[PDB]
Short mmCIF file of C-alpha atoms and ligand atoms in Angstrom, two decimals:
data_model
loop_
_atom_site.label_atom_id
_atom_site.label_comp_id
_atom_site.label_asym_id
_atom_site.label_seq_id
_atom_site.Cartn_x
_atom_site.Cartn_y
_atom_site.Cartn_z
CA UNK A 1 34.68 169.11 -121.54
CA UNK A 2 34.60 165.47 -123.16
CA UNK A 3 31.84 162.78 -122.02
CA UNK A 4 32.81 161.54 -118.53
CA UNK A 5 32.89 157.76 -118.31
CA UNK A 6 29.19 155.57 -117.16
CA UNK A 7 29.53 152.49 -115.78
CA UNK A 8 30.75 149.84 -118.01
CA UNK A 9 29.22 146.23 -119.57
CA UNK A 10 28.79 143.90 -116.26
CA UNK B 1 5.85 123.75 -120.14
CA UNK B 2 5.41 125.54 -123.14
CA UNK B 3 6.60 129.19 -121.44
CA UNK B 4 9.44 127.75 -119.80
CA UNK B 5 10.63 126.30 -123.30
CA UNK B 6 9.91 128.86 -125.20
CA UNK B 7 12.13 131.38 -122.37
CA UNK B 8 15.09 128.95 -122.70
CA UNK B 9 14.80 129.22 -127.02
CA UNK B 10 14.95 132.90 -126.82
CA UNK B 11 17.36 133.01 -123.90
CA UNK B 12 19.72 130.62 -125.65
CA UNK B 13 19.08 133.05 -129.40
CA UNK B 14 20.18 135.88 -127.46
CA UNK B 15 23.44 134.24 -126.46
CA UNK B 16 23.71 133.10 -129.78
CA UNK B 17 23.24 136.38 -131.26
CA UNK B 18 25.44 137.88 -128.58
CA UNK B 19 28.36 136.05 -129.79
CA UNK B 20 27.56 136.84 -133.63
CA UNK B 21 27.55 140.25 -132.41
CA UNK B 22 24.21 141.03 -133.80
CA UNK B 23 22.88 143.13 -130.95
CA UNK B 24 19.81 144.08 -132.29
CA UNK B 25 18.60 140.62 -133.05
CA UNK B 26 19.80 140.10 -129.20
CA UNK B 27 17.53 142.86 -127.97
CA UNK B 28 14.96 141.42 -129.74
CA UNK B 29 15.63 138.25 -128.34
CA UNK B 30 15.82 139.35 -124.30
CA UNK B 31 12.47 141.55 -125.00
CA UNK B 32 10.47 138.40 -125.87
CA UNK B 33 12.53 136.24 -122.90
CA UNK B 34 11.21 139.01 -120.59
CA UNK B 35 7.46 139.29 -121.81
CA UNK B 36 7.39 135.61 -121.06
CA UNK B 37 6.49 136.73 -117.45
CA UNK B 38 9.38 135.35 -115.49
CA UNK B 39 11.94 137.45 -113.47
CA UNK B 40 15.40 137.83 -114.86
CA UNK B 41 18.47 136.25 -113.07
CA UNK B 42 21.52 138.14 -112.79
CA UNK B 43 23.29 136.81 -116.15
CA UNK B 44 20.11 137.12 -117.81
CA UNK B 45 19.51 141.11 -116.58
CA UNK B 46 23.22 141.33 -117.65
CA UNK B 47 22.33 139.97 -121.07
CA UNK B 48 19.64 142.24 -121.44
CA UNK B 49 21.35 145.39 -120.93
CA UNK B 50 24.67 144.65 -123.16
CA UNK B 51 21.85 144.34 -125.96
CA UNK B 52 20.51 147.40 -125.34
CA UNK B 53 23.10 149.56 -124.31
CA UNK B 54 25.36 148.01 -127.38
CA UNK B 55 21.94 148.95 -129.87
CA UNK B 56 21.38 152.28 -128.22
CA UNK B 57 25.16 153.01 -127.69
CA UNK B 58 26.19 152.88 -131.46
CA UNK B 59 23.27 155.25 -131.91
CA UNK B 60 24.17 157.59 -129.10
CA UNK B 61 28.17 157.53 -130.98
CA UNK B 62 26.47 157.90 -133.96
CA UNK B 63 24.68 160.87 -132.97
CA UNK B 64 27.50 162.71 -131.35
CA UNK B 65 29.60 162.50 -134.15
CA UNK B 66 26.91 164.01 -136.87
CA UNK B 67 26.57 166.66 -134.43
CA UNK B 68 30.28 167.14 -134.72
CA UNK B 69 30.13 167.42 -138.52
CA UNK B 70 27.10 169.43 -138.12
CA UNK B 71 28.54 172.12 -135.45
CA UNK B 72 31.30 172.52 -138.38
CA UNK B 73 29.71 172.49 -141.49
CA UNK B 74 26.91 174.45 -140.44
CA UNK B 75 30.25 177.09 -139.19
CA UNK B 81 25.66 173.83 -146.25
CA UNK B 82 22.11 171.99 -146.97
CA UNK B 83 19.52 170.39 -144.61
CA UNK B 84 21.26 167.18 -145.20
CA UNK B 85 23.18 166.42 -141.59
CA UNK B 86 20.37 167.92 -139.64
CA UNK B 87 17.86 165.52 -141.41
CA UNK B 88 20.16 162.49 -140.90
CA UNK B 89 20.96 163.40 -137.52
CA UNK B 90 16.96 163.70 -136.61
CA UNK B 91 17.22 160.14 -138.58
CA UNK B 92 19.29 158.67 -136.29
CA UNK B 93 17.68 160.96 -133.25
CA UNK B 94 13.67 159.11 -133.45
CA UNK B 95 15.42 155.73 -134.13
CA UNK B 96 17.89 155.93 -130.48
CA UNK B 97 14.74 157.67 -129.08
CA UNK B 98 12.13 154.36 -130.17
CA UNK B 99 14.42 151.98 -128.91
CA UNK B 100 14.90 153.55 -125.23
CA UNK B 101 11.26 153.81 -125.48
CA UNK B 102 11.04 150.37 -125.53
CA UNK B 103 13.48 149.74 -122.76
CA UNK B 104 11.60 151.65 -120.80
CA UNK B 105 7.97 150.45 -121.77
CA UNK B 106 9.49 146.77 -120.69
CA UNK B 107 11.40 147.99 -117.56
CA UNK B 108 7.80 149.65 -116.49
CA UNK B 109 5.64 146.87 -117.95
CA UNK B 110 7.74 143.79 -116.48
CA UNK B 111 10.96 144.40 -114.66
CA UNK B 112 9.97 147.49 -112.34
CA UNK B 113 8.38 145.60 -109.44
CA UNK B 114 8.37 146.05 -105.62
CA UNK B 115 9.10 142.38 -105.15
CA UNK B 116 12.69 141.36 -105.44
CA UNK B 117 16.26 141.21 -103.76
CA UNK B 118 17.59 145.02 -103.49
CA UNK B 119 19.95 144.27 -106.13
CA UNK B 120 17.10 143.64 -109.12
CA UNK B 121 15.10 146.54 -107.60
CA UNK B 122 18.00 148.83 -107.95
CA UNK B 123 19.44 147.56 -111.59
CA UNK B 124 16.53 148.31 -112.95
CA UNK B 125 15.57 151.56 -111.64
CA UNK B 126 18.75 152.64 -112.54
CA UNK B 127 18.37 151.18 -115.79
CA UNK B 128 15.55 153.76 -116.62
CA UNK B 129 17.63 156.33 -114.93
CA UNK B 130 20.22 155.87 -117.63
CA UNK B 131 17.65 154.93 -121.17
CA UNK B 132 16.08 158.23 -119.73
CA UNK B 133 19.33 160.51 -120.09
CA UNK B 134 20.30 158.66 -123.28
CA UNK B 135 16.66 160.45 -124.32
CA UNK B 136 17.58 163.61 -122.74
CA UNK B 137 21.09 163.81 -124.55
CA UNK B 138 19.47 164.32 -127.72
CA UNK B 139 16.07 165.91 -126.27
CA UNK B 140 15.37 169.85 -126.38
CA UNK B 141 11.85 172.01 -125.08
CA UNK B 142 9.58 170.74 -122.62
CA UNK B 143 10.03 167.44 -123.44
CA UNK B 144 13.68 167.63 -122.25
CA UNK B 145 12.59 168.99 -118.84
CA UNK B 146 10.14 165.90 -118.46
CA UNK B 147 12.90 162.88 -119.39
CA UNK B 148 15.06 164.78 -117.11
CA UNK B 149 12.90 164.76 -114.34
CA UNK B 150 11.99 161.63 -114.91
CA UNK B 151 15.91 160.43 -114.87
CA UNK B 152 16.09 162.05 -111.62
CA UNK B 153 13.32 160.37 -110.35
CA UNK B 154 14.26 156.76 -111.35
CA UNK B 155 18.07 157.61 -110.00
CA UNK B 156 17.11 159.34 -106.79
CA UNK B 157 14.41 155.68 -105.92
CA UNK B 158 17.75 153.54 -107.01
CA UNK B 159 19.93 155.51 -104.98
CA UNK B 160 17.61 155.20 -101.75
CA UNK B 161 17.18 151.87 -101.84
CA UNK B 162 21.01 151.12 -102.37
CA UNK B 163 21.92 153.78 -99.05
CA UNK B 164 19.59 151.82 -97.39
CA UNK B 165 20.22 147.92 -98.82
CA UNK B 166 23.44 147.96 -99.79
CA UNK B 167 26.74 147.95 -98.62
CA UNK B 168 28.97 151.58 -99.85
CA UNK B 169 31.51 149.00 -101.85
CA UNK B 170 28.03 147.25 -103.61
CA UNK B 171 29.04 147.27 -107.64
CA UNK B 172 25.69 148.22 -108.37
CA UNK B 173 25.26 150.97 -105.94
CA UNK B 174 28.62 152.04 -107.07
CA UNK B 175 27.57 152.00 -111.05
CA UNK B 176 24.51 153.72 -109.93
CA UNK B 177 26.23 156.80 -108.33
CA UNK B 178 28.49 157.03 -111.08
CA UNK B 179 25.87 157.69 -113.68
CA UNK B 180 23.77 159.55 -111.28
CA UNK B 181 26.74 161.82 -110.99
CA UNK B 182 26.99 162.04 -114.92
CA UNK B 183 23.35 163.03 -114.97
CA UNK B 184 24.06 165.83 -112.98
CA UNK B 185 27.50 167.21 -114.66
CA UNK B 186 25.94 166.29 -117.89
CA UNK B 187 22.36 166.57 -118.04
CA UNK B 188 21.04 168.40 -115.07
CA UNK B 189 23.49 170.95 -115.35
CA UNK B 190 24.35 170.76 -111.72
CA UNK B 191 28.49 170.31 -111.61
CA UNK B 192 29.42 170.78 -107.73
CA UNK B 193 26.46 167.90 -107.16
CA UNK B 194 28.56 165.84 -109.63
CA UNK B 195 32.03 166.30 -108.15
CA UNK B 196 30.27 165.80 -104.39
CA UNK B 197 28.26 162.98 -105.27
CA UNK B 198 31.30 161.01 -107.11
CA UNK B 199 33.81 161.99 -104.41
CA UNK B 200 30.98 161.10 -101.47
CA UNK B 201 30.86 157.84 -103.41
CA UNK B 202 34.66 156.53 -103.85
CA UNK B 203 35.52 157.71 -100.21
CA UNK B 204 32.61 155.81 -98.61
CA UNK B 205 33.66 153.00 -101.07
CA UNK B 206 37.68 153.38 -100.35
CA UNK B 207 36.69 153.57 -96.16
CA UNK B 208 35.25 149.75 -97.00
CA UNK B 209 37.91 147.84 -99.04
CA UNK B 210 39.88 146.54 -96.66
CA UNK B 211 36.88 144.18 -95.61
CA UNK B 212 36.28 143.07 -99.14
CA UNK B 213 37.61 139.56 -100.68
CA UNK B 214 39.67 139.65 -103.69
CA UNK B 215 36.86 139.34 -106.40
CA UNK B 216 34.71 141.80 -104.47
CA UNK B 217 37.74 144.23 -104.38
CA UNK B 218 38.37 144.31 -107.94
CA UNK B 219 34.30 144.52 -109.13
CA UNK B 220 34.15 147.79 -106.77
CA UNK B 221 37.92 149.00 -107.68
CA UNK B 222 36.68 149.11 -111.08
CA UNK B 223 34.20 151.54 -110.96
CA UNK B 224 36.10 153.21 -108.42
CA UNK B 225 38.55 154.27 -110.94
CA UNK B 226 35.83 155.82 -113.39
CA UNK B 227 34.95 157.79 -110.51
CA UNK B 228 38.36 159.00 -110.03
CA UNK B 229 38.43 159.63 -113.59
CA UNK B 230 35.89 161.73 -113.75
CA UNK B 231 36.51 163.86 -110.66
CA UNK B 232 39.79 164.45 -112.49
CA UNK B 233 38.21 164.94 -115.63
CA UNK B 234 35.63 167.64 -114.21
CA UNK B 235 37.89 168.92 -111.20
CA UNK B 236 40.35 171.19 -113.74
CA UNK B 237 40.88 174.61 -114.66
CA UNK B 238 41.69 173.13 -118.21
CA UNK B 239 37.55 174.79 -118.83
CA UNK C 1 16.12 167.89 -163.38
CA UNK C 2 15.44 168.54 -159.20
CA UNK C 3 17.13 165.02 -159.37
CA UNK C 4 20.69 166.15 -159.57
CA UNK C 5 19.56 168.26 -156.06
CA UNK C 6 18.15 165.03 -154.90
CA UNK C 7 21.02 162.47 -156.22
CA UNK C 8 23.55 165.08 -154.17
CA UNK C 9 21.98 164.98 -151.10
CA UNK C 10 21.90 160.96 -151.16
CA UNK C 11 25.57 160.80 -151.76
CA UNK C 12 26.35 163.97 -148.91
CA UNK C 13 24.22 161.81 -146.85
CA UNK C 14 25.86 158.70 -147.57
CA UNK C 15 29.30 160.32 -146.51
CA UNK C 16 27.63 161.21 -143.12
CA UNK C 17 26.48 157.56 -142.84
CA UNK C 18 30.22 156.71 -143.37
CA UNK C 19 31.21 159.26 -140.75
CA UNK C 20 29.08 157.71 -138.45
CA UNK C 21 29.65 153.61 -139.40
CA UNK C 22 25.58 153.64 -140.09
CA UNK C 23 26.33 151.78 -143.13
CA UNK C 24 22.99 150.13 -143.63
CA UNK C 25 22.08 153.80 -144.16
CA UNK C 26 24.77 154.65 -146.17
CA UNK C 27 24.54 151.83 -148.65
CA UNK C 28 21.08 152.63 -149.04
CA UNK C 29 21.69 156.11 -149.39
CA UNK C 30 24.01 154.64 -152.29
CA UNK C 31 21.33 152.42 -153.56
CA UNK C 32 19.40 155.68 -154.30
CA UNK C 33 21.74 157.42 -155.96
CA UNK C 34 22.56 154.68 -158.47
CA UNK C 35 19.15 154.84 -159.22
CA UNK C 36 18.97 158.32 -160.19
CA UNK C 37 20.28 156.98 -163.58
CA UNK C 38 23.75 158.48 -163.76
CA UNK C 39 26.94 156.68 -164.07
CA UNK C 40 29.22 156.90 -160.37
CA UNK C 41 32.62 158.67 -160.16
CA UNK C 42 35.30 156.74 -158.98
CA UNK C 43 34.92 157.98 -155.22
CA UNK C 44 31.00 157.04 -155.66
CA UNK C 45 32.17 153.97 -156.54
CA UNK C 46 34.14 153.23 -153.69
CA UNK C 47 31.40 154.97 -151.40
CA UNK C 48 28.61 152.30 -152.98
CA UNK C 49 31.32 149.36 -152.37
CA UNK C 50 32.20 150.63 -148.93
CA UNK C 51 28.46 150.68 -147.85
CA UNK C 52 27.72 147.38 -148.73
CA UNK C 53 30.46 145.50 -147.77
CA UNK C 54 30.62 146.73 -144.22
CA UNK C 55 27.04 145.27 -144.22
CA UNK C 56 27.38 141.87 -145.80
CA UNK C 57 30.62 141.72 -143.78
CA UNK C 58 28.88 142.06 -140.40
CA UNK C 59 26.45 139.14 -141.95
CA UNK C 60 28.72 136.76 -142.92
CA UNK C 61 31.16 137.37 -139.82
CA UNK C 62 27.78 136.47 -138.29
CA UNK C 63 26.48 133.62 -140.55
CA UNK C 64 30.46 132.22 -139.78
CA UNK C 65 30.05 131.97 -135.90
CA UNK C 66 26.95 130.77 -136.31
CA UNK C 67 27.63 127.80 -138.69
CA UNK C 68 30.31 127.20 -135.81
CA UNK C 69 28.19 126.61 -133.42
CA UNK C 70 25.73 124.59 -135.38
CA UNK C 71 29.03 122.33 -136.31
CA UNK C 72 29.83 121.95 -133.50
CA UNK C 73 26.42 122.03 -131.13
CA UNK C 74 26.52 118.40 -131.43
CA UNK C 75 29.05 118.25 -128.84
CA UNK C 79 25.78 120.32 -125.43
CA UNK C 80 22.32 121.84 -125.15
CA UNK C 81 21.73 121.10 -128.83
CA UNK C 82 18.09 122.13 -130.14
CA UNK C 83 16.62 124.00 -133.29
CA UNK C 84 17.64 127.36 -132.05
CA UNK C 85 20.98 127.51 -133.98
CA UNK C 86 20.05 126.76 -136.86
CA UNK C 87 16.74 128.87 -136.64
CA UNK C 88 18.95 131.77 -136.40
CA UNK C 89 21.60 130.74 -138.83
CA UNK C 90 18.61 130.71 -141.28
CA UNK C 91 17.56 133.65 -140.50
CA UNK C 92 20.89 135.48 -140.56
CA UNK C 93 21.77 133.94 -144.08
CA UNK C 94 18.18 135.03 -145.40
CA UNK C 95 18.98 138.63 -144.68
CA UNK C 96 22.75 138.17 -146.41
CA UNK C 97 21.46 136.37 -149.30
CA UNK C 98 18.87 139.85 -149.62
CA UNK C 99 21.55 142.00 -149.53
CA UNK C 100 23.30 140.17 -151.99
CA UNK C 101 20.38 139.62 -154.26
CA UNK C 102 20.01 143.74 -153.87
CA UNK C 103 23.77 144.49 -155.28
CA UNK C 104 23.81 141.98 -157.96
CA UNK C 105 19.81 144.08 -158.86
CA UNK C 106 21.86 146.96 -158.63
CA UNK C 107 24.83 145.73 -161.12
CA UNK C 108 22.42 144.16 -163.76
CA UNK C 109 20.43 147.01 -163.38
CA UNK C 110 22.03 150.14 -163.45
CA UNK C 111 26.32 149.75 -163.36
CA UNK C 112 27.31 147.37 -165.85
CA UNK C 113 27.15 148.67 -168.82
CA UNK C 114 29.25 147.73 -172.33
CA UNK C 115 30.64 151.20 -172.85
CA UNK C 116 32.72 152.73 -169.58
CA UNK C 117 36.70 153.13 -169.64
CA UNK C 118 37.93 149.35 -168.76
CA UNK C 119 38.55 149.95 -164.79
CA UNK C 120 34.86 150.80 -164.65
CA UNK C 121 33.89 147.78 -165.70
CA UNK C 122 35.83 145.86 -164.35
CA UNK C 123 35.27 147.51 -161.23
CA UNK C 124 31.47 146.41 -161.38
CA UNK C 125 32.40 142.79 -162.61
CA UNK C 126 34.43 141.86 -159.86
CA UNK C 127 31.70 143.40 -157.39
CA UNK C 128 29.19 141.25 -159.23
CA UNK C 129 31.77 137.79 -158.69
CA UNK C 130 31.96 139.19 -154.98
CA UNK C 131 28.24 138.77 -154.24
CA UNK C 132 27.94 135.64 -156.23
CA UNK C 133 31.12 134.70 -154.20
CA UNK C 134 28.99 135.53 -150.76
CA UNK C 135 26.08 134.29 -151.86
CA UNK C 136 27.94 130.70 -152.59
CA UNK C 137 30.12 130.82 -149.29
CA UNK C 138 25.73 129.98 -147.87
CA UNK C 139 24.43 128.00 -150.85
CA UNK C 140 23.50 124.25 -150.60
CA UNK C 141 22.94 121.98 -153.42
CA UNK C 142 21.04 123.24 -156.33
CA UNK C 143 21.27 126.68 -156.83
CA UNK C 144 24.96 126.65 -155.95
CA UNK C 145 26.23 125.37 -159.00
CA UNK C 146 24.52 128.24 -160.99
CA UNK C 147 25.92 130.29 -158.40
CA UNK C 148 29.47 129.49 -158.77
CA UNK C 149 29.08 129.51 -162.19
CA UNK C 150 27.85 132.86 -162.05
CA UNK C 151 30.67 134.25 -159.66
CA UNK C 152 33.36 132.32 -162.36
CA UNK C 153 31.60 134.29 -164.94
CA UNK C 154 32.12 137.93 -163.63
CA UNK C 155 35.30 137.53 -162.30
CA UNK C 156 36.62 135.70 -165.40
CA UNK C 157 35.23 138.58 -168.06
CA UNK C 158 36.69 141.18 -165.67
CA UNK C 159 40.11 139.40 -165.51
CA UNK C 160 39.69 139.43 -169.18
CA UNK C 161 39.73 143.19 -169.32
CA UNK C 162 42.05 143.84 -166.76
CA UNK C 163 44.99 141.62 -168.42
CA UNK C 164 44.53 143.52 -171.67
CA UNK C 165 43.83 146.88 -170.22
CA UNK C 166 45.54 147.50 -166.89
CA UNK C 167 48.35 147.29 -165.55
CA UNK C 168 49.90 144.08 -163.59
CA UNK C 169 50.05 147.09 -160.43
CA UNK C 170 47.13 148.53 -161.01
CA UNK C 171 45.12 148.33 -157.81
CA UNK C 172 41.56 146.99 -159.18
CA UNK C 173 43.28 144.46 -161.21
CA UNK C 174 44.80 143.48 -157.94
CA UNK C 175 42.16 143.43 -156.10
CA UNK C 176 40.65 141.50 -158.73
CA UNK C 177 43.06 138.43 -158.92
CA UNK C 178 42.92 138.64 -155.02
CA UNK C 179 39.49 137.97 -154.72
CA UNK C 180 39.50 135.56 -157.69
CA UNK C 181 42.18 133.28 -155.74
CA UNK C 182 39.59 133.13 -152.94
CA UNK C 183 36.91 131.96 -155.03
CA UNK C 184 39.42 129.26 -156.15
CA UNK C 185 40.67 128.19 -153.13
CA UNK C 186 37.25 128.83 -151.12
CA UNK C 187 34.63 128.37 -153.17
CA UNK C 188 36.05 126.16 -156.57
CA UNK C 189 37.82 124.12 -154.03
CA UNK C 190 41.18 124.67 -156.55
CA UNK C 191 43.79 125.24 -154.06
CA UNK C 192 46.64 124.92 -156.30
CA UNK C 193 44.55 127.28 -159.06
CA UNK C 194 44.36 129.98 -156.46
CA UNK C 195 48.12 130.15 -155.09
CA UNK C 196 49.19 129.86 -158.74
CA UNK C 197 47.18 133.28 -159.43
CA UNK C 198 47.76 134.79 -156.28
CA UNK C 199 51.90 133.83 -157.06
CA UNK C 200 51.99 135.08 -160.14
CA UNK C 201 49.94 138.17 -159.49
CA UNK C 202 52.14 139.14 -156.52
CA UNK C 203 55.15 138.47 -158.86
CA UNK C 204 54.07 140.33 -161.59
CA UNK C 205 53.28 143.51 -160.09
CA UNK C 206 56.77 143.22 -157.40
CA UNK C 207 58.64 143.46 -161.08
CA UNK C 208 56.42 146.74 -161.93
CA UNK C 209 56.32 148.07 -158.35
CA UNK C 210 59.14 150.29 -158.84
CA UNK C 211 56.68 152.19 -161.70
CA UNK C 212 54.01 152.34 -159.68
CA UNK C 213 52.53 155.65 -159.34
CA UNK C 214 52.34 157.15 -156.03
CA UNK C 215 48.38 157.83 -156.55
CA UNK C 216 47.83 153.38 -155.89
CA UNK C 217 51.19 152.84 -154.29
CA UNK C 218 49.20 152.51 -150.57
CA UNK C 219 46.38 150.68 -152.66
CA UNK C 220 48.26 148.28 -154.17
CA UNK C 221 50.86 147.71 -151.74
CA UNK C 222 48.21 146.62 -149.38
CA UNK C 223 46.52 144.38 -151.95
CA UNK C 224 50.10 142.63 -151.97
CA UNK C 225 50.37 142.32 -148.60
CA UNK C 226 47.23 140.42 -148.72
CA UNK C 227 48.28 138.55 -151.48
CA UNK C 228 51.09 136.91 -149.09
CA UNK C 229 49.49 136.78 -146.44
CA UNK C 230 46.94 134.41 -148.18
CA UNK C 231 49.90 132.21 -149.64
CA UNK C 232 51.47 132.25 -146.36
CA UNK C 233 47.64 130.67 -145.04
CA UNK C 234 47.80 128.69 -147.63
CA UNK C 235 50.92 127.34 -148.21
CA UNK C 236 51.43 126.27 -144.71
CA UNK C 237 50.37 122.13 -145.02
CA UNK D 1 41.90 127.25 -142.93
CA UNK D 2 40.66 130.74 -141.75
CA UNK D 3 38.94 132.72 -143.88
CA UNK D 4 41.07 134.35 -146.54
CA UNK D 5 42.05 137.96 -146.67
CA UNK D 6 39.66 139.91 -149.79
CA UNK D 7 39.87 143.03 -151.53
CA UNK D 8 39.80 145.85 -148.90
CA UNK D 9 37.70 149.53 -149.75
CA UNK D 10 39.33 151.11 -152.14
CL1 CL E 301 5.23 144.76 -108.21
#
């Protein structure tokens, strides 16, 4: 399982 | 007066810096901003995390990619274990001192929901960047500490903030990754993310056009990981 | 005698630096070995070079957007703060550089060597003069060209009577020289002349080349035009 | 003029 996606640069 | 001045400098170096792309200098720059007492506005909380999360995020990319190596070459010497640690205590100093200033100056009761809940969820996320590399007891104390600092975030956005809120969104989403990721708890993951984006998508239609595509954004990375993490494929 | 252990594990941990972009680690990882004593291989060559200029190259991309803005903060808040930090990001180049030309003096050029050693080393040492005058004012920047002219001249002098006109570090070497003409001797016509006639020259070996520096060169020449094309516009 | 290509690695 690859790295699931945080939430981005505001 | 002399604080206010002496704010706008460091405010204005960490712009500067921002645009030179020297992150760490920017970090540097936002930490002394903040410890001048005043609250952050919204740009400037925004400016304070890209410095951060740009410092600690080429350390946490870093990391993962001399444990690669290491998983494979140790399939010879104490070299890539050494460097990793290297790189390991300098990612783990600097979320120390995001934290240390989100506790000693940003962490207040005071404030619009909004503030309360960036920052809280701020220390959610510096304390799973610590408990990605972390092992022993000291990984079971970051994690419950992430937990903590999500779960306060996440009440007061149920109870502030609107379902389509960016922030309340970007909090769920890494609260979810905590718990695929971290606290090993998958099905908590996939319900919290899909709980999220449905109680989002029910909203949309009442949101304007700029509002729409803020919350559609993280939306998405939702999605992405419910696909990502709802698959057979392991 | 443990040294050779020691000098081994700086260079396997330079590699992993490289992996992982950390190239303030890996050029001083590089740094080490070179002091160790022992003349570098060709790929430690290229491993020193590739350390340090990812991490002048970060500091002058900076130092660049900085001087920008300090050009051109005349036109709205204005104030010391620019050129505070411009200082302080062209201190920390002008160490680096001061640290590599130590290094050259000290431990790389040398008299004896095959010729694409030292020339290798002399063009590195007209490099950092070169990036140390791109940020010099006044005095010292005389000596400072002078001293870039100097290296880069006495390695053109061995690379036209040793190497071939395809070789890639004789390429590289005119390419670089045509800069310091154009950007730093203010000689425009001296550096298209060079880079010209060193493009020309090695298109009429090309089909010789050896497949070992055919990417190598090839790419110097493409940089080669690309320059003239910049400069050649009007 | 914008700063001139150098001498990549390698
Ligand atoms: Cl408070």
């Amino acid at each position: 399982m690859r790295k699931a996606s945080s939430a981005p640069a505001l | 007066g002399a604080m206010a001045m002496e704010r706008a400098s460091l405010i204005q170096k960490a712009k500067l810096a921002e645009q030179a792309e020297r992150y760490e200098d920017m970090a540097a720059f936002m930490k002394g901003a903040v410890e001048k007492g005043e609250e952050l506005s919204c740009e400037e909380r925004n400016l304070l995390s890209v410095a951060y999360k740009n410092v600690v995020g080429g350390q946490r990319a870093a990391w993962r990619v001399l444990s690669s190596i290491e998983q494979k070459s140790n399939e010879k010497g104490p070299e890539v274990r050494e460097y990793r640690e290297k790189v390991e205590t300098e990612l783990q100093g600097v979320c120390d001192t995001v934290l240390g200033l989100l506790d000693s100056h940003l962490i207040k009761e005071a404030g619009d929901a909004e503030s309360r809940v960036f920052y809280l969820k701020m220390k959610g996320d510096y304390y799973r960047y610590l408990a990605e590399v972390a092992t022993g007891d000291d990984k079971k104390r970051i994690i419950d500490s992430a937990r903590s600092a999500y779960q306060e975030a996440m009440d007061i956005s149920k109870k502030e903030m609107p379902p389509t809120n960016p922030i309340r969104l970007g909090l769920a989403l890494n609260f979810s990754v905590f718990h695929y990721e971290i606290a090993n708890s998958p099905e908590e993951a996939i319900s919290l993310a899909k709980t999220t984006f449905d109680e989002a998508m029910a909203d949309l239609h009442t949101l304007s056009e700029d509002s729409y595509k803020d919350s559609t954004l993280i939306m998405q990375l939702l999605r992405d990981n419910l696909t990502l993490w709802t698959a057979d494929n392991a």
